[PDB]
Amino acid sequence: CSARYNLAILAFFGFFIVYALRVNLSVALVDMVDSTGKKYQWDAETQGWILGSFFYGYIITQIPGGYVASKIGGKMLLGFGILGTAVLTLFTPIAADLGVGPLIVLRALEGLGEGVTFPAMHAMWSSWAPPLERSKLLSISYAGAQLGTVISLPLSGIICYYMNWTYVFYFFGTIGIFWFLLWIWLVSDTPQKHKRISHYEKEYILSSLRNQLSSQKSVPWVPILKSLPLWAIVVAHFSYNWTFYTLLTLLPTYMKEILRFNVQENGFLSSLPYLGSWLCMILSGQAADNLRAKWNFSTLCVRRIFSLIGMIGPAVFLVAAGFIGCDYSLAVAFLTISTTLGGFCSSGFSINHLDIAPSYAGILLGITNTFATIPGMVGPVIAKSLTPDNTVGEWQTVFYIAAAINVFGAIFFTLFAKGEVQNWALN
C-alpha cells in the first residue's frame, strides 16, 4: 500500500504486541501459582506486587519518552522499546525461578520499555500524518492496543491449557522480536528518510505539513499548567484507570477463584469485556458527533455526559457483578456490561485535552498518563491485600472501592472540567 499506511499497519501490530506482552501475565499468573508447568507458592500480597510492578516502570518513561523521541526520533525509540519488552518477556520463566524479586524487577523493566512507545508513535505521526488524515492514521495505529488486549487473553488461556504457562512468554517474545525485524527493515522516521516512498506521496505529505509546521508557535514555551480544568481530566483518568487496571490484572484471578472457570474458558470470557469496550468506544465516537451536530450541546455538555455514562455505568455494573457473585452467567454478563459502558470515556475525558488546550496535546497527555498510572501500581496490591483467598465478600469490598472511586472521579470531572481553549494555551 502507501508508505504512511504501511507505517499505520506496522504500528498496529507493534501496539498489538505491546499490549499482549503487558496482559499475558494476568492469565499466566493464574496458572503459575499453586493451591504441566512449574508452580510457585506465592501468597496473596505477593501476586499483587508481581502484577503491579509493570506500572512502576511504566510511570517512569512516559514523560521522558517524548523528550527522547524529539531527540532521537520515534522509529528507534519505539522499535527498541518493543524489542526490550519482548526479549525481557522471553526471560520470565527463568526470572520466576530466581524468585519474586527478579520477577518484579524484570516486569518493571518491561514497563520501562513499554512506557516509551506512545510518545514515539506520536513523534512519528508528527511528520508522517497529513492533517486531514491524522485521525484515521492514529486510529489505525492505536487500535492495535485494543486488539492486543482482546486477543492476548484467549491465546494465553489456550497456551496455558494445552501447554505450560511458559510458552505464553516464549510465543509472545518471539513474535515481538520478529516484529522488530520487520519494523527496522520497512519503516523510517520521516518521509524524507524513507527509501521506498513515491515522488507524489512524499510531495503530498510534505505539502500537507508544510505551513502547519510554520504554525508551531507552542514549541519554545510551556506555562504552568496547574489549572483545575486539567486536574479534572487528571482525576477522571485516575479514577477510570483504577477500575480498568484492577480488572485488567485481576479478572482471570476472579474468574478462577470465584466463578471457578477453566483456564481456557477463563481467557475466552475475560476477553469479552475488552471486546465490548472496543466496540463501544468505536460507536460512541459517532454518537458524540451526532449529539453535537443534531443538537449543539456546547462541546462540554457532550464531554461531561459521556464521562458520566462511561464512569457511572462501570461503577453500577461492578457493584452489580459483586453483588450477584457466584452466579457465573450474570457475573460475566455484568463484568462485560461495566467495562463495555466504560468506553464512552473515549469521547468523555479522554479527548478533553484536545479542547482544553490543543497544541499542548503531548504535554497534557504525558501528564495525565503519568498520574493515571498510579492506579496500576497500587490497585492490584490493594485488591490482593483485601482478598486473602476468595471470600466473595472480599471481592465485593474490592468492587465497592473501585466503584466509589469511579463515582468520585465522574463527579469531580463534571464539576470542574471546561470545554473552551484555556487562557494560557493561545499562542
Swiss-Prot record:
Keyword tags: Amino-acid transport, Cell membrane, Cytoplasmic vesicle, Disease variant, Glycoprotein, Lysosome, Membrane, Phosphoprotein, Symport, Synapse, Transmembrane, Transmembrane helix, Transport
Outcome (variant: G267E): In ISSD; some patients may manifest a milder phenotype consistent with Salla disease; markedly decreases H(+)-coupled sialic acid transporter activity; abolishes L-aspartate and L-glutamate transporter activity
PROSITE patterns assigned to the protein according to its UniProt record, in alphabetical order: MFS
UniProt-annotated location(s): Basolateral cell membrane; Cytoplasmic vesicle, Secretory vesicle, Synaptic vesicle membrane; Lysosome membrane
Top-level lineage group: Eukaryota
Impact upon substituting G310V: In ISSD; abolishes H(+)-coupled sialic acid transporter activity; abolishes L-aspartate and L-glutamate transporter activity
Gene Ontology BP term (one): monoatomic anion transport
Primary localisation category: membrane
Family matches, as CDD domains: MFS_SLC17A5
Lumenal topological segments: 97, 161-166, 240-267, 326-330, 384-396
Segments on the Cytoplasmic side according to the record's topology features: 70-75, 119-139, 188-218, 289-304, 352-362
Gene Ontology MF annotations: carbohydrate:proton symporter activity; D-glucuronate transmembrane transporter activity; sialic acid transmembrane transporter activity; sialic acid:proton symporter activity
Gene3D superfamilies attached to this UniProt entry: MFS general substrate transporter like domains
Catalytic activity entry: N-acetylneuraminate(in) + H(+)(in) = N-acetylneuraminate(out) + H(+)(out); D-glucuronate(out) + H(+)(out) = D-glucuronate(in) + H(+)(in); 2 nitrate(out) + H(+)(out) = 2 nitrate(in) + H(+)(in); L-aspartate(out) = L-aspartate(in)
Expression (tissue specificity): In the adult, detected in placenta, kidney and pancreas. Abundant in the endothelial cells of tumors from ovary, colon, breast and lung, but is not detected in endothelial cells from the corresponding normal tissues. Highly expressed in salivary glands and liver, with lower levels of expression in brain, spleen kidney, muscle and pancreas. Expressed in acinar cells of salivary glands (at protein level).
Membrane topology: Multi-pass membrane protein
Reported effect, R4C: In SD; frequent variant in Finland; alters intracellular localization, only partially targeted to lysosomes and mainly detected in LAMP1-negative vesicles and in the Golgi apparatus; completely devoid of L-aspartate and L-glutamate transport activity, but retains appreciable H(+)-coupled sialic acid and nitrate transporter activity
Transmembrane portions of the chain: 7-27, 49-69, 76-96, 98-118, 140-160, 167-187, 219-239, 268-288, 305-325, 331-351, 363-383, 397-417
Residue pairs linked by disulfide bridges in the UniProt entry: none
Cellular component, GO, one term: apical plasma membrane
Chain's role: Multifunctional anion transporter that operates via two distinct transport mechanisms, namely proton-coupled anion cotransport and membrane potential-dependent anion transport. Electroneutral proton-coupled acidic monosaccharide symporter, with a sugar to proton stoichiometry of 1:1. Exports glucuronic acid and free sialic acid derived from sialoglycoconjugate degradation out of lysosomes, driven by outwardly directed lysosomal pH gradient.
Protein family membership: Belongs to the major facilitator superfamily. Sodium/anion cotransporter family.
Pathology noted in the entry: Salla disease: Sialic acid storage disease (SASD). SASDs are autosomal recessive neurodegenerative disorders characterized by hypotonia, cerebellar ataxia and intellectual disability. They are caused by a defect in the metabolism of sialic acid which results in increased urinary excretion of unconjugated sialic acid, specifically N-acetylneuraminic acid. Enlarged lysosomes are seen on electron microscopic studies. Clinical symptoms of SD present usually at age less than 1 year and progression is slow.
Official protein name in the record: Sialin
Protein's organism: Homo sapiens (Human)
Originating gene: SLC17A5
